[PDB]
Design a protein around this ligand. Structure first.
Ligand SMILES: OC[C@H]1O[C@H](OC[C@H]2O[C@H](O[C@H]3[C@H](O)[C@@H](O)[C@H](O)O[C@@H]3CO)[C@H](O)[C@@H](O)[C@@H]2O)[C@H](O)[C@@H](O)[C@@H]1O
Ligand SMILES: OC[C@H]1O[C@H](OC[C@H]2O[C@H](O[C@H]3[C@H](O)[C@@H](O)[C@H](O)O[C@@H]3CO)[C@H](O)[C@@H](O)[C@@H]2O)[C@H](O)[C@@H](O)[C@@H]1O
Ligand SMILES: [Ca+2]
Ligand SMILES: [Ca+2]
Ligand SMILES: [Mg+2]
Lengths: 682, 682
């Protein structure tokens, strides 16, 4: 019946309605957070479905409290502490069995359904999940349109009752692959704030062998309902009992900072299944990349032909278009720059045959993932990098041809091992083939999961763009060091509205719940070749190495642009990519975030602040520093006249000595930020 | 404009209608065979398509005449001899380019379309092929319902005008996977006979990177029109220029025998791409097989569970159902029998975990193709077979889960090499996954092609059940040693109407055009465990080793049944499976076929006759024997009272000495036949 968090601040009441419908309710500090909300499923082709006519057959309670050491993360040790209530239901007429297991942490609630082995439910098809989250009122939400194919939108900040009105403007077009489902449909992770000051997050954890959950708002009664991603046949889960859904998560706090600090999502995922983890390596990198994204270079090698056919087109005899990014010469410039600046690795995109046809052609045999272009010396470059203690990050764009990638995967992973690539950036740009498939179906999520597991067997790290947004699986497979799976720094190069000034004050409350993002920060030249304008200050872009947590951190700009602001670049070079502790000092979604983190193995701290549309003075306590020690702090801040629109390169740098007793006050510009290194005094 | 066969008997006229529609016509010995028929395509999302407004830009004629040695076949040397006309078209308003290339052999016509590299047609989608074959009248046809998922039907013999009427009854239900498209749709290869004595076959050749062609009859004008197989999204070809369709084939003769003798289909496929072909091996085999098909055994190992989950179900601890066919003990019986009787191999089905769930569950992770059941000692059995100079044939049923098979394929092929399996029997039973895909789409055909190519790289032969019916590709990839892809001997065990008595007099005129069938002949006990009755006599079943040509010949029955009729079994033991010559002596589709073949490397001949509903005395010209030589003939015949319904086991055996000058005469029962070995006297 009743479940409480270990600290007593949460109560979850479970019951059945008069008609046997299962419902739950969640209360925080005596205030409704989830009102009476219904549970269960509509099945396809079924006499009854799983909405009602249950009775309670059994309940079991338990408790758990253990720590586990992540391979990489914000802390060196994570606490998994909950109470558990496991309700065994039996449906009348069908004798069908369905367990609903709840775990209630000090950060909030997670629940999921299990179907044990049974005689009258075996193979079955989910037509819709009917899992509800009834809100207590017309809350503020930070949201992006529900989509089966992209998450690449600007967030909207509005009341729940305003989402219908704002859907037309918020649903931005021009994407290679995007599909709407509802005038009131949004993605998770969904962030909200109530009128009475509660921060409420709705998400899921352990998305495996299942369809991605979106939410559909009933904007009359303020009920969000699970809405899963259809597959190529319109199905929302081919299930086989015994099976189990992913957890649904409600993360709550009266203090926005604790939302960011929460590990609930990881804690709901099963323990690492990789026994030996020292080959997984947090990575700071540059790449041949922004060149193409910002309109200076091509991924393609030749323009000679209407189309290309791998194994037929002789690229060694084709006319070079002279614009191609991934030349031996150019890849060497980025290696040189990485080695000189203490960076680990270098991404190269457009190294392989096929790029002439990579987008909008819905092509199956689009890449072989193994054959270099004639101007890219794979052997020499990997030798040259390795001699400079640098690695290349492999790039595997699939262009939606999942079968084609799967057939090539083994040989492509082997070619990585052969040359000493240990990490791959993968991509799923365009509609998934065959047409009618979606990016976030059960079918396609299986593929992303398969890529990761196989990667692991080869001791290869994965960072997967356009994949399903993460749900904590990195605990289980910590070689998933990244996803994009959200609107990244790249949209700052794509004109239109680029990224709103407060984007990076919302991502940590939404997309980062479930895992890190490859955000590709560190832009210093905001006015790029193709006319686009990045909406950030330099100090902003420095702070992202701390405020957008990731074991995979790019410095996305060109070496030349870093040489123009060497003094500011010092923070990017200094900052760590893995942490023993982390403290969120200030946070309010859509306005600002300020966080300090202790570099793993060290007594060094790195702090960042990111700030939204409204210029603001940030006031912090430096008592996270160790008592009795002096530290050199180097503050990289916005100039007073900086702004993300018309004065993006105005920064200051100053040195002052502080202790655990010190306070700090710092202006942040509109769309700006600050960054601090703290080194103990010698 | 005009094209002639090298012997003058065929004339094909090409032209444009006033509206620019391309059309062809075919004449044989002054008789219309193809009346004015239209060519081209309906494109998706294209106002104008490729139906008309062409003009002729160029024509090129040529000739070719060469022989080529197949690896395996009916003959030691095949003659490829045609005249070629290549018409280059250009569409007005679109500048689109389309070649139509015709080759005219002494056996008939093939043509296809090519799209060369061009500036205004790159990626495009075929909505329907618009290739016609206008008949001269209401011909007799031997046909099966048009289907995107099965060819496992009984043939119907009727007039073209009768097909609409007969469709309901001919479209038999109860198949795991079957989808109709038209009340007048039929499959190819389609056999016809005109009122005035022409044998007309309509088929295709080199079905690669393209959708399978069916025909839809307009039964008002007796025009058949290409009707391709939709994919999961309803498409009939995702094309990229430069590309090219398969050949469409019209094989004609005034003598039915020449239809069977024709190699036109092979001749239109490209030369072998396997350089070294001695590992490809015509194979006579038995197997643990019929036991399951005929209801005596299970593929499954246990009945203990509602469903199974690979990696989770512990089969070592499951309750054996003791019906399971593929035990070490039982597989040894068939090895012992193969070795003792000069057979090459032993198929085993149900050797691997998963079989509890193999049919109609639409299960993805249905098999791993590597993990033996706990009662099948893969190592001991392969050692034991090899030490008795026998091989096992691997069985890979996919149960429609193509992605699952593809992911497992490399390791499954490796496990074959590890234990000395060199041939695999594959299967595609149930709907293709994901749901909505078809068996004979471009997408799925790509999969069958991929299996074969990869098989070749491992030096593995492939025999694929429920795959697309063959179109001559074995020339190009002679490791494709068979397909089922029609109604096989198995339906003789499936009750209902089993196989019509004259089935095996139709298959050579239809399904065998394009490649051999694994028909699994050689039944001696016709009344099997589950009550079903095989509609053949014993002499019939001996004759199939010659009248259903295959480099892969099964003796389907149980060793016990062969040991009981050892005298008759002698033919199965003696007969060869590869040939240096073949002569079709008599043939009439749906009535009889009589053919004699010379065993490769030998002076031995083997003759078979199969006979339809009507009992018939056959008169055999033995002029194919070498002049002035004496031969021992052993005739295995129907007794005079034999009959496929009520007296299936009454056979005689006599020896007589013959020469090329002998003519001898033999009764064949209703659904019966005869078989003869010819050995030169010592
Ligand atoms: O692997 C290469 C590249 O792939 C991903 O980025 C590709 C990105 O391309 C398109 O973006 C278009 C924008 O949506 C429009 O709004 C803009 O107008 O034009 C761009 C350029 O095509 C796709 O539509 C989009 O879905 C896709 O993500 C990786 O994220 C990137 O880092 C890679 O380098
Ligand atoms: O690898 C297993 C087996 O697969 C193929 O044959 C399987 C065959 O199974 C079904 O046949 C059914 C018939 O449709 C019904 O008419 C009959 O009554 O019952 C049987 C079994 O339910 C599928 O429906 C059918 O499409 C499929 O081809 C191979 O051909 C065989 O050799 C293999 O051993
Ligand atoms: Ca992207
Ligand atoms: Ca079959
Ligand atoms: Mg400037």
């Amino acid at each position: 019946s009743d479940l409480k968090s270990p600290d007593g601040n949460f109560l979850m009441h479970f019951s059945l309605e008069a008609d046997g419908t299962p419902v739950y309710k969640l209360i925080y500090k005596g205030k409704d957070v989830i009102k009476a909300s219904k549970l269960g499923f509509t099945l396809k082709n079924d006499n009854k479905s799983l909405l009602n006519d249950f009775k309670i057959e059994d309940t079991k309670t338990s408790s758990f409290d253990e720590n586990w050491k992540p391979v990489w993360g914000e802390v060196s040790s994570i606490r998994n502490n909950y109470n558990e209530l496991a309700v065994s239901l039996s449906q009348k007429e069908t004798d069908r069995k369905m367990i609903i297991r709840f775990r209630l942490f000090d950060d909030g609630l997670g629940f999921r359904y299990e179907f044990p082995q049974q005689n009258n439910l075996i193979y079955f098809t989910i037509k819709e999940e009917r899992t509800q989250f009834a809100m207590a009122g017309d809350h503020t939400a930070y949201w992006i349109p529900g989509d089966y194919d992209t998450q690449e939108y600007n967030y909207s900040t509005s009341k729940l009752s305003e989402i219908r009105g704002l859907m037309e403007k918020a649903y931005t077009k021009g994407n290679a692959s995007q599909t709407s489902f509802s005038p009131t449909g949004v993605q998770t992770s969904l962030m909200m704030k109530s009128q009475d000051g509660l921060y409420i997050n709705l998400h899921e954890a352990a998305l495996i062998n299942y369809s991605c959950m979106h939410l559909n708002l009933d904007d009359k009664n303020f009920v969000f309902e699970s809405w899963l991603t259809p597959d190529s046949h319109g199905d929302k889960g081919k299930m086989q009992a015994p099976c189990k859904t992913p957890w649904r998560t409600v993360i709550v706090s009266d203090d926005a900072r604790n939302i960011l600090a929460s590990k609930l999502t990881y804690n709901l995922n099963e323990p690492s299944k990789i026994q030996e983890t020292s080959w997984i390596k947090p990575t700071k990198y540059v790449g041949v990349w922004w060149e193409m994204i910002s309109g200076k270079s091509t991924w393609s090698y030749t323009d000679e032909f209407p189309s290309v056919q791998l194994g037929v087109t002789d690229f060694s005899k084709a006319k070079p278009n002279r614009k191609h990014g991934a030349t031996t010469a150019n890849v060497k410039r980025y290696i040189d720059f990485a080695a000189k600046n203490g960076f680990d690795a270098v991404l190269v995109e457009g190294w392989n045959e096929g790029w002439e046809d990579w987008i909008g052609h819905e092509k199956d045999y689009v890449f072989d993932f193994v054959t270099p272009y004639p101007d890219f010396d794979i052997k020499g470059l990997n030798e040259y990098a390795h001699a400079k203690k640098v690695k290349l990050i492999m790039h595997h764009e699939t262009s939606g041809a999942v079968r084609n990638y799967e057939r090539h995967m083994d040989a492509a992973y082997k070619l990585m091992k052969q040359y000493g690539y240990d990490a791959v950036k993968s991509g799923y740009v365009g509609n998934i083939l065959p047409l009618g498939e979606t990016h976030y179906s059960q079918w396609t999520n299986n593929h992303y999961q398969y890529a990761i597991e196989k990667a692991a067997d080869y001791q290869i790290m994965v960072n997967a763009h356009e994949a399903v947004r993460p749900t904590g699986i990195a605990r289980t497979y910590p070689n998933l060091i990244g996803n994009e799976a959200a609107r990244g720094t790249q949209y700052q190069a794509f004109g239109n509205d680029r990224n709103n000034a407060n984007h990076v004050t919302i991502l940590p409350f939404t997309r980062l719940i479930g895992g890190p993002m490859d955000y590709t920060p560190g832009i210093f030249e905001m006015d790029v070749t193709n006319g686009s304008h990045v909406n950030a200050t330099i100090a902003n872009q420095l702070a992202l190495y701390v405020t957008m947590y990731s074991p995979l951190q790019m410095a996305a700009d060109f070496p030349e642009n870093y040489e123009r602001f060497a003094d500011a670049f010092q923070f990017i070079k200094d900052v760590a990519v893995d942490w023993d502790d982390s403290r969120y000092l200030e946070a309010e979604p859509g306005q600002y975030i300020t966080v300090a983190r202790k570099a793993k193995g060290t007594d060094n701290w790195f702090l960042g602040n990111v700030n939204g549309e409204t210029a603001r003075v940030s006031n912090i306590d430096l008592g996270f520093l160790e008592k009795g020690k002096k530290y050199t702090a180097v503050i990289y801040a916005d100039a007073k006249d900086a702004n993300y629109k018309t004065n993006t390169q105005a920064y200051t740098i100053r040195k002052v000595v502080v202790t655990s007793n010190s306070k700090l006050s710092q202006f942040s510009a509109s769309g700006g930020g600050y960054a601090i290194s703290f080194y103990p005094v010698a």
